[model samples]
Target: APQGLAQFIKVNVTLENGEPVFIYTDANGQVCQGDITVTQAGTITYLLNDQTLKGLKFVGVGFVTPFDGIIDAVTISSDGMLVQLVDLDKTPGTTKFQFVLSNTANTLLVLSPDAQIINRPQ
Candidate 1:
C-alpha cells in the first residue's frame, strides 16, 4: 500500500458476551483485545495483532478461528513483511502471522519464527 492514503482492514473477534469486537487494521498500527480488566499500564493481557500497512490506506482480506484464550503480545523478525503477534496471554507462545505486501505473486506463505519464504499453495 502506498503511503499517505487511507484504507481499512477489519478483524472480527467474538467475545464471551456474544458481542462482536471489530479490530480495524490500517496504516495506524496495533489493535489490542480482551484488556478490559488491565490493572496497570502494560500489565493487561489481551490478544494483539500488529501490521505493517505503511501506506495511508488499502484493502485486504483475512480469516481467523475463535481464540478463546487471551492473546497478550506479538512480534516479527527482521525484513518480515507483517506485524506479528508477540505472545498470546503475554506468555511465551506462538506468534500470529499475516502477509500484506503489494506483490501478491505468492499469497500462501506461512512464516515461521526464523525464516521468510514466498511460494504459492500447492
Candidate 2:
C-alpha cells in the first residue's frame, strides 16, 4: 500500500451505446478529440501515443523520455486496476511517462533512462 501520502482526482468515464467514449486533448491542453473513458481497472490497453512534439507537461509534474516504437511494457496495475498509457512530452530529447492515476490505487513508479526522481502523487 502507499505508506506515505496519496491524492487522486476522480474523473467520470461515460459510455454511449455499447462503446466507450474517449476524449482527446490538443497540444494546447485543449480538447481536440472528445473525452475518453478511463477504466479504473486499466483493462483498456493502448499503445504509446506519440507526445514527443506535443510537450509533456502537467500541472505539477516532472519530465519523461520520449519513447519510440511501442514502448510496450506492463503498465497494468492489476487484473481490475489499470494505468492509462499517457504520452507526456516535456522536453525535446525526453518527455514524460504520464498516465491516469486512480483514487484507490498503489503500485510501482517506473521511468525511462536519465529519470532522476520518482515523482509520486501526494
Winning model by TM-score: 2
Candidate 1, residue 98: the lDDT equals 34
Q: Estimate each model's TM-score.
A: 0.19, 0.23
**Global CA lDDT of candidate 2, please?**
0.29
Q: lDDT per residue, candidate 1, 1-122, as tens digits?
A: 32221123333222335222335343346553311221111321112232322211112212242152223333333433234332223332232333322323334432212211111111
TM-score of 2: 0.23
Model 1: number of clashes? 16
Cα-based RMSD of the predictions, in order?
Answer: 18.1, 15.4
Off by over 4 Å in 2: 1-12, 24-68, 84-122
The TM-score of candidate 1 is 0.19
For model 1, the superposed segments whose C-alpha errors exceed 4 Å read: 1-63, 70-82, 88-122
CA lDDT, every prediction?
Answer: 0.27, 0.29
